[model samples]
Target: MKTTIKDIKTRLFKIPLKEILSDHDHFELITTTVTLEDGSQGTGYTYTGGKGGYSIKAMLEYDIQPALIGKDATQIEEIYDFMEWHIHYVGRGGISTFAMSAVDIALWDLKGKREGLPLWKMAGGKNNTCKAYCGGIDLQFPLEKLLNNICGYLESGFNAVKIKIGRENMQEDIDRIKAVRELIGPDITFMIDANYSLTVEQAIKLSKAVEQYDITWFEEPTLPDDYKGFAEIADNTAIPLAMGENLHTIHEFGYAMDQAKLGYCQPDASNCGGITGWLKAADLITEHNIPVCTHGMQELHVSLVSAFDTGWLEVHSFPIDEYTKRPLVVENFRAVASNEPGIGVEFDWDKIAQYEVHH
Candidate 1:
């Protein structure tokens, strides 16, 4: 049963929500609709950093979809290759992947729906539930507020929690992690993220102090572009290094992998070339025996995490603005897709229409 991509359509919407940390006025949601030869349609959602939502939508509409309209949706490998070559000129790392991700994800959703199985089960199902961790905009909160936030997440059933570390003084950062660890007790898995917010020297110095608390992983200690810095950190620290949210292309992943032996790879479904790119990246990581935890959009990543036999998936319990509603509908961070096919996104379009930005 060969399925060819027929037509692609998109809708851009915003939702207003308030958060404790950052003052994000809106959350951008890009929904892509893909139609196949059989006239069946599949929907997938991508998130932009609030600002790029419309531009990404335009790129998908004017640049990518035209090239993919008549291609085979089931030939996932071939499709990824074609996009990598033909679309390389547009900006392979971030913008191109952000645009290509919507379609690639939509195609996977289409394939899943046609097969009448959940994506995980279809992709050789593994564990029904993976370990979940929580972290959402921890940078904006002070130590006390951050501690309260961590307490809420731990009580809500998350075994691990991540907090922002690079924005403050070294002493302050160390004190915050220590306070959180003391409050949460030693058994809880605590991780810290610098968000590419530090320098190599700063990261190394900070890691030395925090390593004693048994940090789960030090994520993105330096800028995403610094493969050399990352390799240095990996070589110098006992703390497992986690990276990949900023990476958008397979080449970037290859570069990171070749330079550093990453303990974990964190790929954002919407950012790292969507599901197709994620699958390819995951396969490469798997060969090297590295595990991955889907970065964000728990609703979309749950299926991908379930589909792949990797380590774990991220379930964010952090408060998001009104535009970004909670994607998980199930209890204890377990969201099961209804028998409904294709991305399993039950988006409230009416709610979305209110924030549409016409380009």
Candidate 2:
């Protein structure tokens, strides 16, 4: 019953966003279809802010598909290593991992379908639900609108919320955090993300200024690559730090765990080598006892976070679930994973076909 990969297909899509996340007016979605020899297929996808869709597609169509066509579909880890080494020399983290991630995720989907087990049970089945937080990409939102957005989440029963920071005027950023904290009150968990938009000094100053807010975590206070900078910020602020959305490799997660001393580890399955790579990163982080959390792609991430007993599922502002058969289901600040066999995300082609970019 060996299920060899039969064929691989890729599609490029330009998905418009409800809110412009930082500089991104749209997200470039690169999806992969891995069909096994027996004719069953699995779907996997990765996304970027607005660029590099072509490069990720080129890597899959030109390189990965050709190399992967005859491999065993169930051997996810081996396949992950195969893809990792295949492009290790030229593509280390960014585009290379992005492409490989799609393929690896497709393989996982296929394995789950083949076994008639849901991805959650296959991953561990520790829980069917995980705590979820409303993550807003509203740094550009008017202050009135920002508070209104939080109100919607609060009314919807979310116990936690995250807001984007890094406005030019530090006082404005402080005010926003203060305002949100005031609105949500002390019982709710509040977080802030600078999106790597600050220097160590700036992050330290910002962290100190917002100390009164009882912030849960300060995410990407400084550049992810600057371990020294992250360490400096961590040292200067009592606020616990969170990171890993931009960390594209397992090794980078390892380095950050060792050097930056994160209070929470957040990984996006889309870029950090899909589900397989994310689990590996989680394994490393668990040794240090840091809670593993997710960045985006809540539709797909719910199962992974739920199955593994991890932390918050970020119901991101990207709106990826809007195109799926079932948008993310949240209740009382928690989200549920798909009970269906294989990975839960099944896109409604009718909804997204018009957005496709043919290459």
Candidate 3:
């Protein structure tokens, strides 16, 4: 039986983050609903922590949507390559990567539904499960709020936590690391993300400064694609460098895997081309022996990462989980994937229906 993508309906939502806690952030969570000709629908989404989601939605609507019609949804890679070629006018990656993420994800959902299998089983087998950490975007949070956030994760059974770094004063970041390490104690795993805000030299210094804490890894300390910077920092620092959420394609990911010596390969299925793109990067890097961790969109990653042979998933600070019908369930420091068919994320349309930016 062949399945054709008869129509694609996309939604852009700009949910306001009512918290006065962040440095600079916004609350746009975008969604794309892919409808097959037989009425099977797969919903996929992306987020802009502080900015730029509308452009992603704009690209999906004007540039990518038209290209999807009449295509065979079952031929996931072919559809992916078709979209990539169709958008050659847009040049390399970035927003174009965003476009691929939503489409590929929706297609995965469709595939899973067609086969009546959750993505985890289809991709990684019944044993698909991964350790999950709470990755927070709480740089602006007060010390109490920050510690409380960790406490909440603790009660939820998460033993791993990744916090934001890269304040103007390096000492503040160091102080925060020390405090968090002390709070989490030796029983918990710790990681830090600089959000690609540091220089190679600066990241090496910070990684050295925090070495006493037994950090699990240092993530995106320098510019994402700077392979030379990555090699230099990896060579000089005691901490292992982790990256991949920003590298948009198989090509960029291949470069990173070849040159960066990344401690962990962290690919967000949403921007990394849903399952298709993420799996491509995962397969390419498996030979390197680096673990394939992840960034944001944990709802989907719960299914995707669990399928990985070896990788961790981030529970993420993003509130997208709340909007889903079933939020991520964590126990024993892992985000568990659901056995339910078809990616297992059912959004609360009754609630999100109110925040629609565009249809």
Best by lDDT: 2
Model 2, residue 48: displacement in angstroms?
1.2
TM-score of each: 0.91, 0.97, 0.94
Give the range of the ten consecutive residues with the poorest summed lDDT in model 1.
Answer: 317-326
**CA RMSD of each candidate after superposition:** 2.7, 1.2, 1.8
For model 2, the superposed segments whose C-alpha errors exceed 4 Å read none
Q: Residue 249 lDDT in model 3? A: 82
Please state the error at residue 119 of candidate 1 in Å. Answer: 1.1
Q: Rate the local accuracy (lDDT) of all candidates.
A: 0.74, 0.89, 0.82
Per-candidate count of clashing residue pairs (backbone under 3 Å): 4, 0, 1
Query: What C-alpha lDDT does candidate 1 achieve relative to the native structure?
Result: 0.74
